[PDB]
Paper text:
(A) Overview of the DNA-bound complex. The DNA has extensive contacts with PolIIIα and clamp. entire length of the 25 base pair duplex is in contact with protein. of the polymerase contact the first 9 base pairs of the DNA duplex. complex, the clamp is at a ∼80° angle from the DNA. in this complex the OB domain is ∼40 Å away from the ssDNA template. the OB domain is far away (∼40 Å) from the ssDNA overhang of the template strand. broken and a new contact between the OB domain and the clamp is forged. over the polymerase active site to a position adjacent to the sliding clamp. displacement of the globular domain of τ500.
Numbering used by the authors:
A (entry chain D): 7 to 189, 208 to 243
B (entry chain A): 74 to 218
C (entry chain B), F (entry chain C): 1 to 366
D (entry chain A): 799 to 927, 943 to 1160
E (entry chain A): 364 to 653
Write the structure that this text describes.
DNA sequence: GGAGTCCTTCGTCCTAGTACTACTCC
DNA sequence: GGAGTAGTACTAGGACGAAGGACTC
């Protein structure tokens, strides 16, 4: 059973801990079972605990005052945990998202270990990078590649990208498997330089040495 | 050569002196004067009859006349090929032996070394070098491409 | 060189020999025939330079030996064109071949027989004859799984494998695979040879399935096949056929049995609304039911519910529909039994009455 | 550059002519200079000689067909012939260049039949019983820009459009996808297959003197939007633009399209015409009225500028008819230039 | 500098009276200097076939050869080459290479210092990085047979007595396998292919002028027979109308001529020597004018 | 909107009317079918602006009127592929057409009827009815002589010329002409009209040459044909047709008849050694005999001698053999009569036993 | 240092082959 | 109704020409 997530955040820290000083603002996740969209999506908004990043604001429009009445990670901790527990987590740049996820988990102070200890952590970007090595494997790149509309989609923010990543994910994990198949000393002659050849050799080396001031044959 | 029909083989010819130099100069000119295809201008084996003096030749190894005939296992064709060098290049024909880890090289080498002792002819090994360090290989592959 | 033959002795040979002629004979004499007249036998050659086709007609009327090379397609059409019982007279006039029939006269250019390429003699290693019938079923049953153009050029052909009393043929894409095995009635030593696809097409075409037994000889680098007086010989592409025993499903524990025709009709219809590139149909099995469905991005959808004998658990699985239709077309039979593992394994398919042929296609992840 | 130098010097400079032109620019007695054939950009040297050669053996060329028959397609390709018309080499015979462009293909196809008829000796049944470099430049801008009197889009001239081509596009609004309208001065439309759908393929030309562009990975509607896309020798369409990482252009999806004709509606865009002082009267009630009368649509107010000696007054026709937008092309047909102003209604 | 020879003039090798204009032979052949002073006379490329013909009649077609020039792998070419092999269309790669200035000696290191967008796209684009890292490994390497001649060589025997050839698929257009510097150091004299369309122009324009002969019985025109102080000429020059005038087509050069108003032939000889970064930025131009 | 009909009633109409519709037209709704339910009737439409084919079928089970337009190819394949005897239930819901039949269930994408180009109504001027069998004769005997893609746009078609109670056809590309005429037994107006190549291909296609009356109404620029509940409508093209009275040979002095199959088999054979591109052959005719000779660059020759009925002088003349082969094949008769004048002039060709048909093809200069 | 000679590479058009589907024959 | 033959459609390869980066004194 396959679980798709896309997390929109209050920007990142570019230095040190990418999660230090930051918290989660929106959770948009879709459930994908047997490569079909069930519609049992997990879409919540959270407490910012800080200012929304100017970058993040320009991406899909989110203001702090909107996420104030909305619940925190603590109110949907168990809810979201059970929703993804014992399934496939397909992520973009797993180090980033997992880092935020586990960060929030430790903030709850329920001794919560890293998600990779009880779940299969899979980045989809790494798969795309293996398929198309050294190519741009961004969502919009792959979108255009697999012929997809990302412009006439009403969902703005996480759930948009999650849906798109699901279609990309299906496209990559299509179409069709491959067939497991692939799968003494003796003599031998030494030709000693004749006296003629030796003379030519000596004269040729003389020229090298007289003109150049060196002879390694002879160095 | 007439022995392998259409098949082109790879060859090293060294000019040992100025007689050779002039013969090599004329050999190259004659290939261009003949005309050619995408492969570039080519020499006939028999042009080495006239264009002969002062030249020292390498057999070509696995990729040569004799190597390819050996790998087919046409013993008559192999004997015809070497015979040419025994006639026109006495003391001036060396069999190339190569360990670069490529297909069939050890099987060829084993059979070539047996032929070389059976004929009493002289051999030289090279590394057929195209680059400075082993890590340059990938870049040269792309250069060729 | 002179001989005289009756049109009707020439016609079936001529048609059959003209099959291999096609692919762009750059070397112009490939579009021509090799004639050798000796005894009361004119021999024919039809060739693509890798394989060769031989025909004899008996000479009842006067004959004289000699050889030349006439243009094959043109000569075939003239003969096919003449009425039944028309008298064809051959006679070489220096550098022309003259073909007469009563009062009509035609003259052919002549290139020397001596320029026609000769393939090396080789000898037989393992030897067998078999009824035409068995050869017919063998080819027909598997031809659809031939690779089209593969970089793995060894897959562009069919493995014939002998051992004891069992020959089993296999042909594949790297995606799907069809297998057929038939009794040959003689203990045979083990050999493996891959004949190139165009070769197998031609061989297929020479079989009328009739009464003359077919006798085949296989050498080190060639194959030779005699049915009566016609003889086809091809080269083999040499070896490393991957182990088909490895791909076979290892005891598929679930069985699904259904009417071949019904099933095939429903899949043909569902196929119309699947993906361009991936031919994707999605399948649901449930307690005694089969649901076929087909999707495209424009929300067009074919959907079938069917009553299917099946014991086992619910599961869904997709595949390339063209390849499965190809097998249902080759399955000219009453009942099929489909033997599964899961949504992500290849599946093996057989006639519910014979294990003689087995068909296995991989799953697609749609 | 060279011509502008000539002109400043006191040098002129006949337009090309199939009949008069040699290889090089030539001096007829009075005409100091007339176009050399080799002067034409796209035409090869072989084709230029071919033309002249045919003209030498035969007389000077009578007609399109006469030309085609004497010189096969091998010498003068379709593309070659297109530029020849655009240069105005044919203007003599085919008064209408638009007419000549259209007549090429049929004559081309015809000629191939003429080649065949020759070769087979074969008998037939009976049968078949003003300025130089200012017109050419004008044509280029129809194909690569034209934007006279601003644009039909007066309410939102370049304000929406932008027409700098790749060079302007690179520095664009950052967003999900830029808002952009492209119009195409050339379109050819082809749709592919594989027996189970297939998204593609659109052909536009994109300005300024840039190149041409695809679209591009869509069309939405499905086949109604595909037809809006069509239209050769015509197109305006609106799309989302981003800088595509993949090259051969930037990416375009058509969110909306409006035609030139629709822009020419000039909604709330509309029509005003400028005419000379001397107009008959009957022109008021006859030709002027008749041009408008058959082409009615899209309530466009008619505004009239009567250039008086004394002053400019505005007389509103508003007799009844609201003009359809196709009228520009028809009006430009003879002797009268119009200008496309902001429609009065909208403001 | 062969116009310094009055003998060249006397022989119709050159077109100028060197004693009239103080032109110096010792730049061209200096007896007090011992190395060959390659006289390198050049001619119009348009008429190569006619000259190959004369020099074959003279020496033998096999004793005559064209001299090859060589293609390396410079900045714009290496970007283009690697980009294509990495599977980009031409558009992608050209949007990078058009940021590299045209400059003769360009290298990747020089490109990075001249253009700040280079560092930027390198760090922001995987494909670009992979590409330039590899272009750096191959910078300046050969690719092909040099294009035609740079010059034509004259041996006393078969050229193959001295150098190897390259020839096309029809064994035509033979070229020496050693390049211009190398081929001459190996002992054979060369003759370069002058690069001008101006003599082709003169030629064709003279045909057309001299047809105005029979139109009104005018003698044919001999460019050598013109007076050297012509006022129409100097009038038009003082009017600055010198675009399309050979050598003097630059906007800057037209700016200079306008301010200078050059009024005698000597001044016209001077113009290319004056029109340079040194003379202008050492006050000499202003001094001269003043 | 809602209907129910029997696969069997729907299927041949579906095939006949879909036939000419482009898989991918340039205006893609042209690859959809307009479906209209009104009264007790389903109206089906395929068009290309030049022609239109309409089928009507009475609705036997409960129904509800409305309009829409569905993707033609896929829908036809779906209908063709359905099981034997299938009764399908269809209903419009929103912007999808849902098809139920048994446990098959579909929901297909839909394009609006409103967008579909409604062809033009026109006034009938001259009308007639005739046996289906006469029509089929008229068309078969003649249609293969039309041009394909002639620039004289009025030759891409066939002129029908009506005089008295006779209707006449002629079809031609300017290099060969065929005339065939039949008595219709009705006094008509006098009108000539050229209907397009593709229209005639398809009209011939649907001619179930059985009993069925065929009734036709012609306009000035359109044509209408009713057979049963199939209705064909096409626009016409205007063009000033060539005068067949100048093409009919002036005074053919010499008359020559011969048995058709023997004549034809002989022409087919001499054709093999003619130039492949131009199909050129030379005819030599003498007292009671015909000798045709040809040649190719390969230096081959064909010569045929046959006994023919000929009284007249010897004569030499060359043709394109494709042109005569095509008439001999179409003419399904016993003996032929040829009426020639001389080597440089038109010839009339006809069944020796019928007079309905007459053909002129011009000779060649090589 | 400028200009021209140099070819090659990219794009467009034409030709040839191969497969699929319809039409005609058994 | 199915099989064989013909015609149409799609894809690949080669040729031709216009554009561009480069190496000559």
């Amino acid at each position: 059973r396959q679980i798709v997530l896309d997390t929109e955040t209050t920007g990142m820290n570019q230095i040190g801990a990418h999660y230090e000083g930051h918290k989660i603002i929106e959770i948009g996740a879709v459930e994908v079972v047997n490569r079909r969209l069930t519609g049992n999506n997990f879409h919540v908004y959270l407490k910012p605990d800080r200012l929304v990043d100017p970058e993040a604001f320009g991406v899909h429009g989110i203001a702090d005052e909107f996420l104030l009445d909305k619940p925190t990670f603590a109110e949907v901790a168990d809810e979201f945990m059970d929703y993804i527990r014992g399934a496939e987590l397909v992520i973009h740049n797993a180090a980033f998202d997992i880092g935020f996820m586990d960060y929030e988990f430790s903030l709850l102070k329920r001794d919560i270990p890293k998600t990779n200890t009880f779940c299969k952590v899979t980045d989809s970007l790494a798969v795309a990078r293996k398929m198309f090595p050294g190519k741009r494997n961004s969502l919009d790149a792959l979108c255009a590649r697999y012929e997809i509309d990302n412009s006439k989609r009403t969902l703005h923010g996480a759930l948009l990208d999650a849906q798109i990543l699901a279609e990309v994910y299906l496209a990559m994990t299509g179409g069709q498997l491959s067939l497991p198949l692939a799968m003494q000393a003796s003599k031998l002659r030494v030709v000693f330089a004749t006296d003629e050849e030796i003379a030519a050799h000596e004269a040729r080396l003389d020229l090298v040495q007289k003109k150049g001031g060196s002879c390694l044959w002879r160095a | 050569c007439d022995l392998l029909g259409d098949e082109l083989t790879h060859l090293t010819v060294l000019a040992a002196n100025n007689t050779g130099y002039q013969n090599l100069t004329l050999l190259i000119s004659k290939a261009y004067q003949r005309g050619y295809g995408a492969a570039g201008p080519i020499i006939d084996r028999d042009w080495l009859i006239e264009l002969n003096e002062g030249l020292i030749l390498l057999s070509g190894g696995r990729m040569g006349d004799v190597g390819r005939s050996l790998l087919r296992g046409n013993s008559a064709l192999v004997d015809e090929c070497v015979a040419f060098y025994e006639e026109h290049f006495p003391d001036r024909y060396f069999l190339e032996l190569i360990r670069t880890g490529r297909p069939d090289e050890e099987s060829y080498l084993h059979a070539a070394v047996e032929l070389a002792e059976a004929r009493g002819l002289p051999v030289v090994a090279t590394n057929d070098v195209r680059f400075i360090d082993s890590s340059d290989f990938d870049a040269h592959e792309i250069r060729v491409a | 060189m002179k001989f005289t033959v009756e049109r009707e002795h020439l016609l079936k040979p001529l048609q059959q020999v003209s099959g291999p002629l096609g692919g762009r004979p750059t070397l112009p004499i490939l579009g021509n025939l090799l004639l050798q007249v000796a005894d009361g036998t004119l021999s024919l050659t039809g060739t693509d330079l890798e394989m060769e086709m031989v025909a004899r007609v008996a000479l009842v009327q006067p004959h004289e030996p000699g050889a030349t090379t006439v243009p094959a397609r043109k000569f075939f059409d003239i003969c096919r064109g003449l009425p039944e019982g028309a008298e064809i007279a051959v006679q070489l006039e220096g550098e022309r071949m003259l073909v007469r029939s009563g009062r009509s006269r035609f003259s052919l250019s002549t290139l020397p027989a001596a320029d026609f390429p000769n393939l090396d003699d080789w000898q037989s290693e393992v030897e067998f004859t078999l009824p035409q019938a068995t050869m017919k079923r063998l080819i027909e049953a598997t031809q659809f799984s031939m690779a089209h153009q593969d970089v793995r050029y060894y897959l562009n052909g069919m493995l014939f494998e002998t051992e004891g009393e069992e020959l089993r043929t296999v042909a594949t894409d790297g995606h799907r695979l069809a297998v057929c095995s038939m009794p040959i009635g003689q203990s045979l030593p083990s050999h493996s040879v891959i004949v190139p696809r165009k070769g197998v097409i031609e061989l297929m075409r020479m079989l009328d399935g009739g009464d003359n037994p077919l006798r085949v000889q296989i050498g080190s680098n060639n194959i030779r096949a005699h049915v009566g007086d016609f003889i086809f010989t091809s080269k083999l592409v040499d070896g490393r056929f991957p182990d088909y025993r490895r791909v076979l499903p290892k005891n598929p524990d679930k069985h699904l049995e259904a009417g071949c025709d019904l099933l095939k009709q429903a899949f043909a219809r569902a196929a119309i609304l699947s993906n361009e590139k991936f031919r994707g149909v999605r399948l649901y099995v449930s307690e005694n039911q089969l649901k076929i469905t087909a999707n495209n991005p424009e929300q067009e959808e074919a959907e079938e519910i069917l009553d299917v004998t099946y014991s086992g658990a619910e599961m869904e699985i997709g595949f390339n529909v063209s390849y499965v239709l190809d097998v249902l077309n080759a399955l000219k039979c009453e009942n099929v039994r489909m033997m599964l593992t899961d949504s992500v394994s290849s599946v093996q398919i057989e006639d519910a009455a014979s294990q003689s042929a087995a068909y296995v296609v991989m799953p697609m992840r749609l | 550059g060279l011509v502008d130098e000539c002109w400043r010097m006191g040098l002129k400079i006949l337009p090309p002519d199939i009949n008069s032109g040699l290889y090089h620019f030539h001096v007829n007695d009075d005409g100091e200079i007339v176009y050399g054939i080799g002067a034409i950009k796209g035409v090869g040297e072989g084709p230029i000689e071919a033309i002249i050669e045919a003209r030498n053996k035969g007389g000077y060329f009578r007609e399109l067909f006469d030309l085609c028959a004497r010189t096969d397609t091998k010498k003068l390709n379709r593309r070659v012939l297109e530029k020849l018309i655009m240069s105005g080499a044919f203007d003599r015979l085919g008064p209408h260049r638009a007419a000549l462009m259209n007549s090429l293909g049929d004559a081309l196809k015809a000629a191939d039949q003429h080649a065949k008829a020759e070769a087979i000796g074969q008998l037939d049944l009976f049968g078949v019983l003003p300025w130089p470099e200012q017109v050419v430049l004008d044509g280029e801008r129809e194909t690569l820009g034209l934007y006279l009197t601003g644009h039909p889009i007066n309410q939102y001239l370049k304000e929406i459009e932008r027409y700098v081509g790749g060079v302007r596009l690179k520095d664009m609004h950052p967003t999900e996808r830029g808002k952009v309208i492209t119009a195409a001065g050339l379109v050819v439309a082809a749709r592919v297959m594989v027996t189970k759908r297939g998204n593609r393929i659109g052909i536009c030309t994109l300005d300024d003197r840039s190149g041409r562009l695809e679209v591009m990975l869509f069309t939405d509607a499905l086949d109604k939007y595909q037809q809006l896309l069509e239209k050769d020798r015509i197109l305006i369409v609106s799309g989302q633009v981003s800088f595509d990482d993949f090259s051969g252009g930037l990416k375009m999806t058509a969110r909306e399209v409006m035609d030139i004709d629709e822009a020419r509606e000039k909604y709330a865009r509309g029509l005003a015409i400028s005419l000379t002082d001397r107009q008959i009267d009957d022109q008021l009630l006859n030709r002027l009225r008749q041009s408008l009368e058959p082409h009615r649509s899209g309530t466009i107010p008619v505004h009239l500028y009567y250039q008086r000696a004394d002053a400019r007054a505005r007389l509103r026709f508003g007799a009844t008819w609201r003009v359809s937008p196709s009228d520009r092309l028809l009006n430009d047909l003879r002797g009268l230039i119009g200008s496309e102003q902001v429609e009065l209604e909208f403001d | 500098s062969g116009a310094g020879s009055l003998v060249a003039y006397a022989l119709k090798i050159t077109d100028l009276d060197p004693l009239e204009f103080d032109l110096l032979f010792e730049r061209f052949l200096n007896p007090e200097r011992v190395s060959m002073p390659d006289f390198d006379v050049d001619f119009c490329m348009e008429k190569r076939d006619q000259v190959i013909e004369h020099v074959a009649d003279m020496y033998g077609r096999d004793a005559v050869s064209q001299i090859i020039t060589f293609g390396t792998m410079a900045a714009k070419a290496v970007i283009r080459d690697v980009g294509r092999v990495l599977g980009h269309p031409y558009g992608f790669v050209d949007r990078i290479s058009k940021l590299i200035p045209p400059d003769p000696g360009m290298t990747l290191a020089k490109a990075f210092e001249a253009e700040p967008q280079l560092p930027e796209i390198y760090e922001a684009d995987e494909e670009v990085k992979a590409l330039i890292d590899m272009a750096r490994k191959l910078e300046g390497v050969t690719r092909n047979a040099g294009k035609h001649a740079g010059g034509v060589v004259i041996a006393p025997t078969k050229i193959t007595d001295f150098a190897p050839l390259y020839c096309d698929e029809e064994g035509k257009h033979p070229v020496t396998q050693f390049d211009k510097s190398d081929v001459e150091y190996a002992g054979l004299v060369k003759f370069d292919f002058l690069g001008l369309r101006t003599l082709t122009i003169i030629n064709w324009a003279l045909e057309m002028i001299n047809k105005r002969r029979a139109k009104n019985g005018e003698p044919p025109l001999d460019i050598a027979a013109i007076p050297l102080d012509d006022k129409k000429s100097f009038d038009m020059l003082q009017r600055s109308e010198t675009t399309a005038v050979f050598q003097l087509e630059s906007r800057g050069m037209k700016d200079l001529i306008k301010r200078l108003q050059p009024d005698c032939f000597e001044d016209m000889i001077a113009l290319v020597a004056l029109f340079r970064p040194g003379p202008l930025q050492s006050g000499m131009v202003d001094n001269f004018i003043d």
